[PDB]
Design an enzyme around this catalytic site. Structure first.
Site, PDB file in Angstrom:
ATOM      1  N   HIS A 166      -0.956   0.692   6.984  1.00 28.55           N
ATOM      2  CA  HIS A 166      -1.814   0.910   5.828  1.00 28.55           C
ATOM      3  C   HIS A 166      -1.548   2.304   5.277  1.00 28.55           C
ATOM      4  CE1 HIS A 166      -4.499  -2.091   4.310  1.00 28.55           C
ATOM      5  NE2 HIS A 166      -4.959  -2.434   5.501  1.00 28.55           N
TER       6      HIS A 166
ATOM      7  N   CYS B  26       0.817  -1.207   0.000  1.00 26.83           N
ATOM      8  CA  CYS B  26       0.000   0.000   0.000  1.00 26.83           C
ATOM      9  C   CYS B  26       0.852   1.259   0.000  1.00 26.83           C
ATOM     10  CB  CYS B  26      -0.942   0.008   1.205  1.00 26.83           C
ATOM     11  SG  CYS B  26      -0.194  -0.547   2.750  1.00 26.83           S
TER      12      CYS B  26
END
Ligand SMILES: [Zn+2]
Lengths: 512, 302
Positions: free
Chosen positions: B254, B10
């Site tokens: 994330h 990510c």
């Protein structure tokens, strides 16, 4: 708190300025001009166009830049402000310092004077403004009774300029805070805060009754203020760079301005568009002093970063063409030492000055050895290179434009050399080991009776006129005398009070 | 649209998809793909794959992978299994500049890299000395050493230091210790201004280890650097993309991007392969706490 010994390598008389000139005062009764030199010396000049050598005297005592001067009491008293943080009070007729005020804690930058009260004020980078009754200051002897102090507060940043009016009812300061602050000096009451400048304000003037003010600023503008209205009533942008110096005629109708852009203008305050370029100087203008012999002033004296001081005549009242091209009178200046190289022998120094002249000096004997002319400076360093190592034992500084040598306890005694390799000859001819700093210290104090053991160091002397200065690291000068004067009762008393124990060890106890 | 997560990638999806919405990036890499005839080939291989899959969806909907870029990058510099988006952005932009210089459109230097001025001004003579550095992003603090503003934070970076007291600046022109102002100034600007938020922290003798700062700045939409410019210009920049991190460490977590199209005037919030949309009003009022707080801010010359 830590005490350093220093000395200046120079001639007994330095007739000419060795650096730029910070401030000017004209005595109209004696036709005498005072210059405040960046070289730490104040000099008195005759302005008679008769004399070929206008020099009268030098007044030596300051240790660093003298930033402002004020002639008081019809020329009887001079007050000086210096970057050594002191204010000094001089007898202006005989030219010697009588008292030293030490209430400031940074460079003192500006002085102000209220003729009708014999009142002076001092201000500097420490944001303090002190008020001094001149007659109280001259009244010092034995038990002075000291002076009670008075200072002004409110300045939030370092102060660069200061003015009082002739009546002593208004005082204004200029600083890097970009606001002019005004007080009543009689009551210390805050009067107003004048906002408008966008940079430092290095030049301030007040009219006779303290109702209008002219300020000159590094933002390039001159501003006229009404103190009765507490606001700006005119802004003038006649310069390209910062305005550093202002004068005004007796009628408060024409303002003379000068600064970083080298150009000097006379601008009519009532009609700005009519303004006259008086001249373009050769270096940034630091201060100007009108000659007021006659109502429409005949000339203006101009101090710059150069060592020469020019008088420009005004005998002939927007402009490309300068009114004047050559000065009307010229006080000659000398060269400043701007570059210094310590040779590998840690004994000789090569210098370059503002004339691109190169000279060779003997640090140990505190004198010049030979002038080398306009040789290449870096080629001359490599030409005298010798592959030898001697520990560093002094430092040199060029802040006054002359060679000043400083000794510190940390490395003063670091350099032992043999008498033979040091160019010396001794009576036993043994060639034992000599400590350079220790021999120099003894020569500097050769005339101090407490060091006399039947006297001196036995290998060389310094010139008797060499100034010897005892100061604290970072700021406070403690005591300054000439080498030959150490035998005096005042000097010997003050030396006993000022000579640090690390010097006493070598010069008195003869320890090493 | 939609970048396949490859297992803790990510960091790469968020930065690449912000790059995809950069004013000059699309046209630039196509220009460089025609110059060559191998990072620029991989960049175009993905962009073509991205643009073609958008057209396939555009015609008839049914229910792209940046794997091409990753394998090239790993051969280019084998750091890679989860890294910081800021470090990988440098390796991408840096290598594009390294190839651009070897080929001779000056892509990276024109629109990412700017010129910095270290100015010292002696207050006694007013002589200005400046030192030049290049910069591609502004390292900016969030908290000091509540909700501080971005102007405050840039002021911390482009600080002014007044030199007064026992330590004075020695002016060679004045040949004497003087008071001085020492300031940081922006001269030449890039098309996109990147702001790198120092939103990470650490403590001592317990827990744990590192820590993230869960109190972001007051982010404005308009931005003008006239206050810090070397010579005041009227150029104004507009916020268009924000990379955000969820987690309490720099190594892993994330990464998500929120880019604006410049749907005109909206917010395209996309995470990995999971794409969403949001409004203007309910996004700037969403950053203050809260699964994530911002890490990178991209403004462009509007
Ligand atoms: Zn300077």
């Amino acid at each position: 708190r830590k005490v350093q010994v220093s000395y200046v390598i120079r001639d007994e008389v330095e007739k000419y300025n060795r650096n730029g000139v910070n401030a000017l005062q004209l005595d109209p009764a004696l036709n005498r001009l005072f210059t405040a030199g960046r070289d730490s010396i104040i000099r008195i000049w005759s302005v008679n166009q008769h004399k070929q050598d206008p020099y009268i005297a030098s007044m030596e005592h300051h240790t660093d830049w003298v930033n402002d001067i004020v002639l008081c009491c019809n020329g009887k008293t001079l007050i000086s402000a210096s970057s050594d943080t002191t204010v000094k009070v001089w007898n202006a007729h005989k030219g010697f310092c009588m008292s030293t005020l030490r209430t400031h804690k940074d460079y003192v930058k500006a002085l102000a004077y209220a003729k009708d009260k014999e009142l002076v004020a001092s201000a500097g980078l420490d944001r303090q403004i002190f008020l001094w009754d001149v007659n109280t200051l001259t009244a010092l002897t034995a038990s002075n009774n000291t002076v009670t102090t008075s200072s002004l507060s409110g300045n939030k940043d370092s102060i660069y300029s200061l003015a009082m009016n002739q009546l002593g009812t208004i005082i204004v300061s200029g600083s890097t805070e970009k606001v002019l602050r005004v007080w009543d000096p009689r009551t210390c009451a805050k009067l107003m805060k004048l906002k408008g400048h966008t940079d430092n304000v290095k030049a301030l003037l007040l009219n006779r009754d303290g109702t209008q003010c002219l300020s000159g600023s590094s933002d390039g503008t001159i501003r006229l203020w009404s103190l009765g209205q507490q606001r700006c009533i005119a802004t003038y942008r006649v310069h390209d760079e910062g305005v550093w110096a202002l004068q005004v005629n007796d009628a408060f109708t024409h303002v003379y301005s000068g600064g970083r852009d080298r150009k000097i203008y006379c601008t009519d305050l009532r009609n700005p568009d009519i303004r006259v370029l008086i001249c373009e100087e050769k270096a940034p203008v630091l201060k100007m002093e009108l000659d007021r012999s006659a109502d429409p002033p005949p000339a203006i004296w101009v101090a710059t970063t150069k060592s020469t001081v020019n008088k420009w005549t005004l005998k002939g009242i927007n402009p490309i063409t300068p009114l004047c091209t050559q000065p009307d009178q010229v006080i000659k200046g000398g060269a400043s030492i701007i570059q210094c190289h310590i040779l590998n022998d840690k004994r000789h120094i090569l210098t370059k000055d503002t004339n691109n002249n190169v000279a060779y000096w003997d640090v140990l004997k505190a004198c010049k050895v030979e002038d080398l002319g306009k040789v290449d400076f870096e080629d001359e360093i490599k030409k005298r290179f010798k592959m030898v190592y001697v520990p560093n034992w002094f430092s040199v500084d060029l802040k006054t434009g002359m060679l000043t040598i400083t000794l510190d306890e940390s490395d003063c005694f670091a350099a032992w050399v043999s008498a033979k390799d040091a160019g010396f000859s001794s009576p036993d001819g043994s060639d034992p080991k000599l400590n350079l700093g220790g021999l120099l210290l003894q020569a500097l104090l050769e005339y101090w009776p407490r060091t006399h053991v039947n006297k001196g160091n036995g290998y060389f002397q310094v010139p008797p006129h060499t100034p010897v200065i005892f100061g604290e690291a970072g700021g406070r000068t403690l005591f300054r005398l000439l080498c030959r004067d150490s035998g005096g009762e005042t000097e010997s008393m003050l030396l006993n009070e000022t000579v640090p124990q690390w010097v006493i060890d070598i010069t008195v106890d003869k320890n090493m | 649209v939609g970048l396949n997560n490859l297992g803790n990638t990510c960091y790469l999806n968020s930065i690449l998809q912000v790059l995809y919405f950069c004013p000059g990036f699309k046209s630039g890499v196509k220009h460089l793909f025609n110059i060559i005839s191998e990072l620029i080939c991989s960049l175009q291989s993905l962009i073509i794959s991205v643009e073609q899959l958008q057209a396939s969806f555009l015609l008839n909907p049914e229910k792209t992978q940046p794997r091409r870029l990753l394998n090239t990058l790993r051969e280019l510099n084998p750091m890679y299994l989860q890294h910081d988006a800021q470090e990988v952005l440098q390796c991408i932009l840096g290598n594009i500049q390294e190839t651009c210089q070897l080929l001779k459109f000056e892509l990276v230097e024109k629109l990412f890299q700017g010129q910095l001025v270290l100015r010292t001004r002696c207050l006694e003579c007013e002589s200005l000395t400046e030192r030049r550095e290049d910069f591609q992003d502004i390292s900016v603090p969030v908290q000091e050493d509540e909700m501080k503003t971005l102007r405050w934070a840039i002021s911390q970076f482009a600080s002014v230091e007044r030199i007064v007291g026992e330590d004075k600046y020695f002016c060679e022109n004045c040949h004497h210790y003087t008071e001085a102002e020492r300031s940081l100034l922006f001269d030449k600007m890039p098309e996109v201004i990147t702001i790198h938020l120092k939103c990470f922290a650490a403590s001592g003798l317990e827990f744990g280890g590192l820590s993230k700062i869960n109190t972001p700045l007051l982010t404005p939409l308009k931005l003008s650097l006239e206050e810090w410019s070397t010579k005041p210009t009227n150029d104004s920049y507009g916020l268009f993309a924000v990379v955000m991190h969820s987690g309490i460490t720099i190594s892993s977590g994330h990464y998500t991007a929120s880019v604006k199209v410049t749907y005109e005037g909206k917010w395209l919030l996309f995470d990995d392969s999971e794409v969403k949309v949001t409004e203007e009003k309910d996004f700037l009022n969403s950053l203050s706490p809260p699964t994530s707080t911002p890490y990178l801010l991209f403004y462009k010359k509007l």
